[PDB]
Symmetry: C3
């Protein structure tokens, strides 16, 4: 909950970068013309954004594996089950990440959140 | 002298609200587009504004009661003295408030000061 | 490294004044419309600016005294050596100041630096 570089409170959320920063960070050239908000005023927006993204991926994952289960119930179908495992990997990691961000604190929720958003957009 | 919500120093005076706030308060949506100044740079303006308002009300109160004393010196004049007591109430409370704001600290002086101004304007 | 007036960290450099100030200083009327930067982001600019200024004055001083040495090697030439001592005084003090600013910390480097710049410009 503290900026390791400046030793100040991490309480500002930059919309350009999706990072949680301190007031001295806000002055640096990195965020010269960036719009910041209080962490306490963007949490709900992103929390609901990740909740829906988690739900839609859980549904897509449930559909995928119920199908993958029928194949495995027949047993080279083995290589097909291997493909499904490799294709759905990034979803399993993303689902895990969102479950961590939602259950945890506001720091874990928002830091680099916009990066997790764009990864969700990819699938 | 501290913001109970954010634990920061109350050193900023918002002109839109007439409140003494902290730097994190200044970031919240409550003061999205409000002009703030240092508490130490608006005290004199408001101090003299309240001094004159106190003086003009003390004079109006002195005139009123000297008149109210003549009536009571006759003794239903009793109900007339009761009316005067009810009519001049808000002035007695305002005079008291200003005496508290002027004698005390800068916090008591400026917090919600603009609210006391508009009440002074009413009479 | 602390603002004696406000007790806050001296981490902001005002370009209009050439002073190192705190965030409460930045709010005062003194710097109403001044551009500030992080001390950590202007040090290099001024450090190199003073390095070149020191070098050019050391060279001008070396040339001057080697000439002053020839005169003193003859010995009223004494009054001429006295004039040289009085003429080159401000350079000897400026050279000393720059050597102090460059060797020391960022505070000593930048505080009132722009004042030392204009004195360097005079010669
Ligand atoms: Zn920082
Ligand atoms: Zn940024
Ligand atoms: Zn599968
Ligand atoms: Zn506050
Ligand atoms: Zn306000
Ligand atoms: Zn009366
Ligand atoms: Zn200061
Ligand atoms: Zn300035
Ligand atoms: Zn000489």
């Amino acid at each position: 909950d503290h900026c390791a570089h400046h030793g100040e409170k991490l309480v500002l959320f930059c919309q350009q970068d999706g990072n949680v920063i301190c007031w001295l960070c806000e002055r640096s050239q990195e965020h010269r013309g960036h719009q910041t908000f209080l962490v306490e005023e963007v949490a709900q927006k992103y929390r609901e954004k990740l909740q829906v993204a988690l739900e839609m991926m859980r549904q897509k994952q449930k559909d995928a594996e119920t199908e993958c289960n029928q194949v495995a119930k027949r047993v080279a179908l083995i290589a097909r089950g291997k493909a499904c495992g490799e294709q759905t990997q990034s979803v399993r990691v993303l689902i895990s990440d969102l479950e961590h961000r939602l259950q945890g604190s506001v720091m874990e929720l928002l830091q680099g959140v916009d990066g997790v958003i764009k990864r969700i957009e990819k699938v």
